């Protein structure tokens with residue numbers, strides 16, 4: 261359905277969340293490889309959805325951006341405010357080796373699960389509010405995959421228009437666009 | 453039934469036409485099965501030819517690409533430099549990248565080792581790279597019966613060669629372009645020594661005044 | 675059968691008698707391969723229609739500017755005038771909007787009768803049965819291209835001929851202002867003043 | 879340099895050697911010389927497109943010997959005259 265009228269591929273029918281027939285190349289021909297790629301897609305999408313609010317809320321209050329700190333950054337904890345006035349325990353270390361030591365744990369306890377559908381939608385322990393035990397589960401999976409894809413595109417943006425204007429607000433860019441809608445656009449990096 | 457370049461009675465005994473680029477050219481008899489050994493044997497020489505040719509395809513299209521793209525004016529001019537001035541040979545020329553070329557070489561050795569050792573282990577023991585766990589994508593790197601043509605979901609993701617005739621013709625085309633690229637890289641090296649400028653500069657010099665810009669006029673080095 | 679580009683000749687087999695504007699003019703046999711003919715007729719339809727619009731923005735402005743009712747700049751200098759938007763921004767906005775319209779047309783050409791429905795509202799439909807002539811209330815608000823096949827060929831033939839002439843005229847303006855460094859209408863009113871010393875040869 | 883005496887000497891020497899080898903006036907891959915300096919025919923096993931039997935190895939050998947002889951003549955004529 262990504263293109264109206266375009267015939268659906270024989271292995272991409274409207275059964276699983278998404279399934280809009282978007283496979284110009286055909287990387288998911290093998291059913292098992294397709295099943296693995298679906299899980300890869302959900303992991304990427306969930307990471308992107310988590311990341312984007314962490315780049316949208318902080319600056320809106322006027323505390324910098326995701327370019328604020330990735331190397332040689334605020335030593336007195338988190339800047340000087342909000343995240344606790346130099347409250348955070350990991351005050352001085354900026355290249356903080358406690359974050360790439362627990363995501364490894366989350367991986368390691370994640371990998372190694374049978375039942376692909378449960379490999380991807382664990383439920384149970386990971387369903388505190390019990391939304392999965394309902395009749396609209398398929399709709400919810402569709403909504404999750406849709407904002408997941410949107411978040412993936414949004415973070416691709418974040419990356420490219422962080423590399424195109426080194427030092428800027430990925431939402432003060434919206435301010436720049438709104439101040440000059442028809443005068444300042446992507447054209448600056450596309451056509452000078 | 454086929455074109456013969458410099459065949460012989462000895463060469464034509466074992467060169468029959470199964471290989472893609474098989475034209476009987478074996479004046480030194482290096483692929484004679486009677487004395488097959490470690491690296492001089494029928495199983496390795498075609499594979500080594502294919503690999504040298506593929507790296508030569510990347511080289512001939514890479515040792516001149518920055519210069520061409522800077523001549524047409526879409527990459528920065530300071531990156532539009534001859535291949536030998538890109539830090540590969542620091543004495544003739546050097547470039548400052550994000551890391552010094554020895555750190556880059558160590559990183560290259562690590563990555564190319566992880567790739568090349570796996571390729572070797574699939575050559576010696578076919579299918580052995582699809583068993584042990586490798587970040588979960590060991591199933592893509594299983595390969596096929598022929599070491600030079602894995603053709604997996606990664607190494608073949610547009611899916612060429614569905615039929616055998618087009619597949620074989622495409623093999624022959626690959627071998628020919630690879631031989632051409634190998635000879636081209638040899639030309640790059642010799643012209644770099646004898647001229648001091650990039651291959652595209654040599655091409656443009658020849659295209660400008662062909663009779664006063666050639667090997668005969670230009671073995672004065674400078 | 676029909677008047678061809680040459681009075682004495684035989685029309686190419688592929689250009690039998692059907693397409694509007696068919697005069698058997700294919701010396702180079704650039705549509706001999708089966709299937710390519712449909713692509714080319716659509717391609718010429720697109721260029722000619724664009725050229726019609728492009729000629730009305732290259733001559734009519736200068737037409738009612740030299741005598742003087744609008745005071746618009748020249749066609750070959752309008753690419754530098756400052757507008758409310760930016761030149762680069764206008765280019766990119768065009769590219770995306772052109773991408774949508776062009777993509778919808780492409781899907782029609784590849785699969786005829788598949789993009790005939792409005793996406794937002796699946797109730798409005800586009801009246802069209804011939805590829806390259808889609809009607810509806812937007813493209814055909816007056817219903818002047820439906821009915822007997824006879825009048826279809828006439829009006830379609832009238833369409834292409836004006837378009838072919840328009841494509842030729844715009845090519846002139848391009849080359850013909852490039853060497854003379856003067857506006858097209860200025861060339862017209864300088865050619866009827868002293869015709870025998872205002873020619874292509876006397877411009878090098 | 880094309881009309882120079884060195885160029886003429888080298889071209890003549892190489893052409894003469896190639897002519898002798900091709901037309902059976904000098905030993906080649908398929909033309910063995912016996913102890914009596916008589917030329918007999920042998921099967922070198924190298925297939926060539928030349929109808930007479932001039933091979934690529936024959937061409938390389940004749941060219942190398944022609945260059946050797948031409949260099950000798952050129953340097954000798956330079957040293958003497």
Ligand code: CLA
Nearest residue numbers: 467471473474475476477482483497498500501504631634
């Ligand atoms: C990595 C290089 C490489 C390798 C391993 C092979 C291997 C092979 N080729 Mg290929 N080939 C190559 C390069 C190579 N070739 C190039 C560059 C050309 C173009 C000139 C060809 C043209 C060619 C034809 C036309 C044919 C082959 C054939 C063969 C097979 C017969 C055995 C053989 O060639 O000896 C093994 C070769 C080597 C071990 C390479 C040794 C190279 C030495 C060390 C140096 C070479 C000289 C050096 C460049 C200096 C140049 C000086 C001067 C000439 C400029 C075998 C599979 C025949 C065949 O059956 O096809 C499948 C056949 O018909 N090859």
Ligand code: CLA
Nearest residue numbers: 635636638639642643646654655657658665666667668670
């Ligand atoms: C891919 C093959 C290839 C191509 C297209 C060229 C092309 C060229 N070379 Mg290079 N060259 C090559 C291989 C090649 N060479 C190899 C293998 C060597 C090492 C022996 C050299 C060594 C070399 C030197 C030292 C010089 C050139 C020069 C030149 C220029 C021609 C003038 C001249 O004296 O040529 C001389 C050519 C040779 C000595 C090599 C001839 C034999 C090789 C195998 C080429 C055969 C060409 C063949 C028709 C295939 C072409 C493929 C395609 C274009 C159709 C021209 C840009 C000169 C230059 O830069 O001028 C300013 C120059 O000084 N070349």
Ligand SMILES: CC(/C=C/C=C(C)/C=C/[C@@]12O[C@]1(C)C[C@@H](O)CC2(C)C)=C\C=C\C=C(C)\C=C\C=C(C)\C=C\[C@@]12O[C@]1(C)C[C@@H](O)CC2(C)C
Nearest residue numbers: 478479480481504507508511514515535538634635637638
């Ligand atoms: C691998 C290879 C080239 C690799 C090139 C590379 C990686 C280039 C890399 C770079 O450019 C880039 C990418 C980026 C730049 O910024 C930096 C560098 C680093 C410079 C060439 C092999 C090149 C290999 C060559 C040329 C081999 C030629 C072999 C021949 C001719 C053999 C002939 C015979 O064996 C037969 C056929 C039959 C026998 O019986 C008889 C004989 C005659 C012996």
Ligand SMILES: CC(/C=C/C=C(C)/C=C/[C@@]12O[C@]1(C)C[C@@H](O)CC2(C)C)=C\C=C\C=C(C)\C=C\C=C(C)\C=C\[C@@]12O[C@]1(C)C[C@@H](O)CC2(C)C
Nearest residue numbers: 699700701721724725728731749750752753841842844845
């Ligand atoms: C679309 C087009 C041009 C349109 C122009 C537009 C929209 C824009 C105008 C402006 O932008 C400018 C310029 C400058 C701006 O500041 C202002 C505006 C106003 C914005 C012309 C097509 C041009 C198309 C032409 C002229 C086609 C040429 C073909 C010929 C003559 C010959 C070819 C063949 O004969 C062969 C070789 C073989 C035969 O079988 C078949 C045929 C195809 C007939």
